[PDB]
Amino acid sequence: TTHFSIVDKDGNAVSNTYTLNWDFGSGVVVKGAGFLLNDEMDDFSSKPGVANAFGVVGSDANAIEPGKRMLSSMSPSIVTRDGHVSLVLGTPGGSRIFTSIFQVLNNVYDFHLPLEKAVAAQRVHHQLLPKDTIYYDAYAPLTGKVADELKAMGYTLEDQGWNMGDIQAIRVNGKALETASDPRGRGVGMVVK
């Protein structure tokens, strides 16, 4: 997955998340055409209760059927206030996508952080199964007193081995625009004026 966010000078906004699923997809290149084919089929439930590559499970609602769309976590988002765009954001990260968006929203709207700090902040993830396991990344690992207390509560902390998303965001304040590209990745933002 990757995500990009765009706002034009008329206040129109696009938030676009798209993917091959795993990085480089199925590994199959269409000979003569040069593009990779996705491995999105793994987002279906292959067997009830059996976890897929992101550790998520399902049963009948997300079983394989011909012509069916496989359940996703991709969550391209636009926040508005009074009929005007205020925040455009999205991210990769499989089953961490919507928990990462939630954390960024909390950072902007509840902790009132500047966008750059809201995106750079440590993010973590829990998803019921694996049991009591909190995932962290090497960009901002869980350490010190917070890690120790969480372990004392009974959590298992695991470095998931890949950065916890790659938020690409635009914030609008009145007429002024700002961009934030996650320091976890190689993104670039530009205000065009």
Partner: protein, 337 residues
Amino acid sequence: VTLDGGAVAAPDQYGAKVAAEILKKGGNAVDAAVATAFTLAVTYPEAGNIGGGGFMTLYVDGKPYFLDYREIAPKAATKTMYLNEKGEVIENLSLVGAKAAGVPGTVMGLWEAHQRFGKLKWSELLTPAIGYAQTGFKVADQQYQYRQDAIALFNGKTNFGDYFGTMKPGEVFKQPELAKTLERIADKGPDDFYKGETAKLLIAQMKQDGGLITSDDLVDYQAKWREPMRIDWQGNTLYTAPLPSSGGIALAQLIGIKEQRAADFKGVELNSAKYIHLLSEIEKRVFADRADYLGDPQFSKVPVAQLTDPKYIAKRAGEVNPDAISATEKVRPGLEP
């Protein structure tokens, strides 16, 4: 709203440069998004794509829209296609090789979005991407690391190394076959990808590799406009992905439950143990519901209204334990009596 300019946040420097060039010359956000999506299909091939799918949330002339260009299972797919003689999942069969692929949606999605909202000519929006395919882009260090991870997974079971073997960190990588594909798409739109020369090449690769995708699958592919998920809180309105994304329902529950539990968050510092524990308690209930109820909404009657009703959100918020971890075995899908 006349803003002080436009803006782009892109996952690499090339998508950013292209989007900005489109905006600077007076294209709208959708024009810029089309050019950017094709650019990243060249420069960020680990994820940007024409062989995959995705979702677009839009706010155009003050109106929210959602475009679903997610892949679909091939007509020959079956419930147990990834299971072996033991009824167990065959390692990596749904991740590596041609049987792992859904029918790609991206070219159709970008076409549908541009047809409805674009201002600039489609063929011109492909020219940046064609150029990066013809004359190259500089491979990033992190991109190469993902390449190495993929090579470990593919283990010589695909032709990946024949096309991406020359991707090397810091070096310019060119993709001439993809440039020709993008030229056909510039001229013929989805007709090339789903009904033309590119379709024929995709079908031939399926024949070669034992895949399932056929011409019928390609000609039948449709992107779908849907009503976006709408979530209101504190005077703000969030528009996000509805089913077949689980993210809209998840965010409605995450935000709604956090608001219900405001007294427990009061004075709690960001990323303290208590804060992280509280988020985890909310996530337990969200993922319980996700696993049980959610899927393509045209293939089952998904109880979206019941799962996002304020009274239900209040009930699930009541389960959050601010001081200790809830027993995982006792976390149930929330509609189960």
